[PDB]
RNA sequence: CAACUCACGGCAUCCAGGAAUGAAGGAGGGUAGUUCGGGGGAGAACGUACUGGUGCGUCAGAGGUGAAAUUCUUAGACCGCACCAAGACGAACUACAGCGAAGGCAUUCUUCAAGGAUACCUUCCUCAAUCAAGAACCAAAGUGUGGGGAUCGAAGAUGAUUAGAGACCAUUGUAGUCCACACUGCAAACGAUGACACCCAUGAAUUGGGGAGUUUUUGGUCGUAGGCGUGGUCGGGCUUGAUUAUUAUUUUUCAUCCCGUUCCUCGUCUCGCCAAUGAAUAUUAAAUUUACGUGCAUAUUCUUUUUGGUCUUCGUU
């Protein structure tokens, strides 16, 4: 069930039983790792890089061939984002809604929503200070 | 002359349909009403007053309308429900009399 | 210091020995379908009707009820037609249908941010469930301030009925009904069924999304036989970058910017010889699934024209 809404989804991805890479690939480790970092320089987040790389190069799960995962790669080269993608996304969303409400003060739905969002921010943040990946001096607004 | 043409239409079940709904989506609907307004503003733009009315009375418009419309979603009827005049040009003697010709 | 088989040595030297279990029928976040809908806010228009007014006609009743009366009229009521004003609302279509956490939400177009489902060999890797305190939201009626005031209408008034009627019924009528900004948190706020997760028999139906699939990897000679694309060499242009130039000491002066084949190196595609997935004489929970057809189908526009050429009307021969 949804975190702070209601709904049951089941839209999902199930990767194959075999964890070995295809026969047909003509890449090797080097080629992959290059293309990862290279596209990262544009300002793509890990998500977007992986999607670009299945649709052009045919590398599905990066982990299978390169022997390690997108975020590890970027950390080792120091291109990993300071505040992690998942929460940064939320923050961006929230700000936009707040802007809207500075002009639209009789809107009700938006404000019900804003609560939910802001709550979620907190919970994520507290698991990025339980798991060290933010300063303990982190704060929202 | 500046006008308003009220319209109306209805969906139509397919001939092999086994479903008791006929209901449309939203995008479907809106297209019709789009592709209605456009045509009734394209034909009547370059057509004058007495030249116009002769279409409506004989139901010439209805032909050209529905036969475009139909593959957007099936229509059972289209009608022109009502027609009305808003803004009129100012009085003239000649443009008037030339539109009646001989007066019995 | 350069040169300099190889070694020692020097170099804020680099990459690889997968260097860190898996990716939950848990949560979160992405990307897309102009996705999906009476979900929410803002703006611009539209529709009849009720009520009032104005103009044009008619002339004596009209309202109302079981029966009446209260009520309005020759200062023309009621009725008919045309038009204007103001406020509220959005019929039928409207459903054992849709959306929202509930309360709730129906004209149209434009616009502003949101949410759910589905699709994925995308990303992250337990971030979750439930819940004293605390916080937000909440039908209608009520309270405050200002605005609006068409309709209906508590309180009140009048007329009836009744033994009585300060009740049901009729004509009226203030608060209220509407809006903006604050207050209140009292519903048969009901499915009288707390939230989250698992197992579980049947036939039709409905709303939203998505899908309907059957010869591959090519290995070895990699074998230039051909083609395609990229970087190099002259050439062409270029005040290209250094730069004579720019005063015509213009004399350049070169690898080069923009173009540039028959040259060398690299990538890829085409072509090729061989090799790779098709041998029944007997069947215990099955080795391979229907169908794949109908009905609809844009000349889809405005032109200003200007040089000829068919015509026409004046002078004059």
């Amino acid at each position: 069930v949804r975190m702070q809404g209601v709904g049951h989804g089941k839209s999902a991805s199930s990767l194959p039983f075999c964890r070995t890479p295809p026969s047909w690939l003509k890449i090797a480790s080097r080629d992959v790792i290059d293309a990862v970092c290279k596209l990262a320089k544009k300002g793509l987040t890990p998500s977007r890089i992986g999607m670009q790389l299945r649709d052009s190069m045919g590398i599905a799960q990066v982990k299978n061939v390169t022997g390690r995962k997108i975020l590890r790669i970027l950390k080792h080269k120091g291109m990993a984002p300071e505040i992690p993608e998942d929460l940064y996304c939320l923050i961006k969303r929230a700000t936009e809604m707040r802007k809207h409400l500075e002009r639209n003060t009789k809107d009700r739905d938006t404000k019900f929503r804003l609560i939910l969002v802001e709550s979620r921010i907190h919970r994520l943040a507290r698991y990025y200070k339980r798991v060290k990946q933010l300063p303990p001096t982190w704060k929202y607004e | 002359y500046t006008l308003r043409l009220f319209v109306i239409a209805f969906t139509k079940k397919q001939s092999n349909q086994l479903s008791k709904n006929c209901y449309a989506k939203t995008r479907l609907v809106k297209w019709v009403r789009h592709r209605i307004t456009n045509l009734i503003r394209q034909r009547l733009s370059k057509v004058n007053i007495n030249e116009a009315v002769t279409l409506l009375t004989r139901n010439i418009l209805r032909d050209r309308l529905a036969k475009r419309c139909n593959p957007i979603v099936p229509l059972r009827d289209l009608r022109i429900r009502k027609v009305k005049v808003v803004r009129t040009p100012r009085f003239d003697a000649q443009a008037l009399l030339n539109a009646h010709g001989e007066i019995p």
Side-chain angles (χ1 to χ4, degrees):
Chain A
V1 68
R2 292 286 152 271
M3 194 178 171
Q4 294 181 44
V6 289
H8 299 284
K10 294 292 181 180
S11 296
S13 294
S14 42
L15 45 69
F17 178 76
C18 298
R19 293 178 295 198
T20 51
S23 53
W24 59 79
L25 293 173
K26 295 181 174 61
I27 51 72
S29 54
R30 306 296 177 83
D31 302 297
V32 193
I33 299 163
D34 189 63
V36 179
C37 298
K38 189 175 182 297
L39 293 168
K41 299 176 183 179
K42 299 178 178 180
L44 302 178
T45 50
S47 51
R48 306 205 68 154
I49 299 170
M51 288 187 284
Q52 194 171 3
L53 202 71
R54 57 169 192 196
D55 299 324
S56 297
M57 305 305 293
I59 295 84
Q61 295 294 300
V62 177
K63 185 179 175 62
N64 292 359
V65 282
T66 309
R68 67 195 71 88
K69 299 165 65 63
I70 299 293
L71 183 58
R72 296 292 173 273
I73 305 175
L74 301 174
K75 281 178 171 178
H76 297 180
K77 280 74 178 180
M79 304 180 73
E82 48 178 0
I83 302 303
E85 60 192 301
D86 59 294
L87 81 88
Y88 175 60
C89 293
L90 295 173
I91 296 180
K92 183 60 175 62
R93 191 193 300 164
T95 61
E96 298 174 63
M97 300 198 297
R98 294 174 60 85
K99 294 177 177 63
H100 173 71
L101 290 166
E102 302 174 0
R103 304 186 304 276
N104 292 77
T105 52
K106 295 176 174 61
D107 205 298
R108 299 181 294 109
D109 197 69
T110 307
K111 306 193 300 185
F112 311 153
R113 300 290 179 201
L114 185 59
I115 303 298
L116 310 175
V117 183
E118 292 181 354
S119 301
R120 199 175 294 114
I121 307 292
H122 308 141
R123 289 180 163 194
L124 297 180
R126 288 160 61 180
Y127 158 78
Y128 290 120
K129 288 181 285 184
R130 189 184 68 82
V131 176
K132 303 179 181 63
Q133 204 170 285
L134 290 172
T137 58
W138 181 258
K139 191 174 179 63
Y140 176 50
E141 295 181 1
Chain B
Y1 290 95
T2 300
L3 303 173
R4 287 191 185 102
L5 286 84
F6 298 94
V7 201
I8 189 166
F10 304 104
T11 51
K12 185 181 62 57
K13 293 186 174 63
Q14 210 63 244
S15 301
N16 61 107
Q17 186 164 8
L18 304 175
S19 298
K20 48 176 163 293
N21 286 59
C22 195
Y23 291 82
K25 300 180 172 61
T26 55
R27 119 178 182 88
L28 263 174
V29 182
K30 297 177 182 179
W31 241 308
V32 165
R33 298 174 175 154
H34 188 48
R35 187 152 156 193
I36 292 292
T37 53
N38 287 97
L39 292 175
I40 304 182
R41 291 178 299 184
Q42 182 173 0
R43 294 179 65 85
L44 301 180
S45 56
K46 53 184 179 179
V47 165
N48 298 79
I49 174 60
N50 298 285
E51 303 181 1
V53 183
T54 313
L55 300 168
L56 310 175
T57 58
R58 335 228 67 142
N59 64 78
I60 299 177
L61 291 189
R62 298 190 182 163
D63 299 353
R64 287 290 302 178
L65 286 169
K67 192 174 291 185
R68 294 293 295 270
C69 298
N70 202 277
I72 302 166
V73 269
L75 298 180
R76 178 157 54 94
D77 296 296
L78 183 139
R79 299 291 170 135
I80 301 297
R81 191 181 63 82
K82 179 173 172 60
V83 180
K84 185 174 181 177
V85 171
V86 182
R87 184 181 64 180
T88 50
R90 58 183 299 276
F91 185 67
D92 195 54
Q94 272 61 62
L96 182 58
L97 292 163
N98 297 342
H100 287 286
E102 300 183 297
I103 302 174

